[PDB]
Design a protein around this ligand. Structure first.
Ligand code: A1LZ4
Ligand code: A1LZ4
Ligand code: ZN
Ligand code: ZN
Ligand code: ZN
Ligand code: ZN
Lengths: 231, 231
């Protein structure tokens, strides 16, 4: 059922309904001569929508907004970027130009600025220490500690028991680390433990890239990260 | 009009005519949650065809045989695999069942056996020392030294000035290294130099994955491999 990377031509965006008022968005991008999929989230908040993460670049994010208008027809009023890399903030300027209020932690905003990446406008408070959680509209934002990056956040949708791990969680078909230049390999498994402890009831776990599954995606990612550490 | 990874569904194979009696074949496959294109070669040999490399797996290789019959209509009678990895030998059993004489160096055959990969039946002698070259019908086979793998061969078609580099040569769009667990990073640039020195006349250079170019692909690959060495 879930759209796979093979089925999505680069430039177009698919929406996958997970529960009442909860969708993922799936886009693709060419990167180093291979095509990667990328996930984000859409969560209904009253008669508006909350967006988690861009669709990886300005072109895709413009298509995301148009696909939301076509299929859902409620306004995206706020968006959160879960860390500073280009697949999560690339497209923030498109969102801002369309009237979406964009948000990230102060750590993400600073790292995006240093990297020369697009910078969400608003700063999320209350997420500065490992284990911090804050409610943001219909989701909980959680900072589990440093992992894929030092600033990475995860997002939980309580009404649907949906956990979106971002790039800190790998899909099962991924057996080797992705980019780790900005990672804290030493803390990544502990941070994953924090997620497990905080969201043990999660039923649907979405990685940054690829197919969702259950909570075993967390242990899978730990296994891959530890294998890379010992490599 | 060279087909790119975005234009080929997994399971389908495209042929690209380079010259009289010379084609590349292009397929795609998912690996670690990304989709990659992959190239091989077809060279006319009288009223028969010589195949260089499978189409990365049994399903793609059967499609490759169907596409050759449809677009060319000459029988593939021999095939050469340019190293032991699955994108070069995956499908050899399909070839053999169809009556193709499959060949690889003894080095490639030993490594495929160790790895659990399909093993081409016949052995190419005369390719065990760096710099060795042997004529094989309408191509020359060349062992440049260890690079992407210890057994990697390159293939030159003198009638068309086509050099097929396999996985030892990267396309321009690839600015970071692929799999290097089996590589000899220390020797890889020296091996590429041997290719340059032996085939300075090459006009059309084909990497193992992605778009062909000129001999600048050799300098490009050296740049990438040295950058990887230093990180
Ligand atoms: C799958 C990936 C790659 C993906 O995830 B990421 O590291 O946040 C990023 C950044 C950019 Cl610029 C492009 C692609 C990506 C990974 O690093 O785990
Ligand atoms: C582009 C690649 C990947 C490709 O190249 B390869 O390393 O020969 C291989 C093996 C398997 Cl099993 C799957 C995919 C590939 C690289 O390593 O340079
Ligand atoms: Zn990232
Ligand atoms: Zn990512
Ligand atoms: Zn290989
Ligand atoms: Zn390859």
């Amino acid at each position: 059922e879930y759209p796979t990377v093979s089925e999505i031509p680069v430039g177009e965006v698919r929406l996958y309904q997970i529960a009442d008022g909860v969708w993922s968005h799936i886009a693709t991008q060419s990167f180093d001569g291979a095509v990667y999929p990328s996930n984000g989230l859409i969560v209904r908040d009253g008669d508006e929508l909350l967006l988690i993460d861009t669709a990886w670049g300005a072109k895709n994010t413009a298509a995301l907004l148009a696909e939301i208008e076509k299929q859902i027809g409620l306004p995206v009023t706020r968006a959160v970027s879960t860390h500073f890399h280009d697949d999560r903030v690339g497209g923030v300027d498109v969102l801002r130009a369309a009237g979406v209020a964009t948000y990230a932690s102060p750590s993400t905003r600073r790292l995006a600025e240093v990297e020369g990446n697009e910078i969400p406008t608003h700063s999320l408070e209350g997420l500065s220490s490992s284990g911090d959680a804050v409610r943001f509209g219909p989701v909980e934002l959680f900072y589990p500690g440093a992992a894929h990056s030092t600033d990475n956040l995860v997002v939980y949708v309580p009404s649907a028991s949906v956990l979106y791990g971002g790039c800190a969680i790998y899909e099962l078909s991924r057996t080797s680390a992705g980019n780790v230049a900005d990672a804290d390999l030493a803390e990544w498994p502990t941070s994953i433990e924090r997620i497990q402890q905080h969201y043990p009831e999660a039923q649907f776990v979405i990685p940054g890239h690829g197919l969702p599954g259950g909570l075993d995606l967390l242990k899978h990612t730990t296994n891959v990260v530890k294998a890379h550490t010992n490599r």
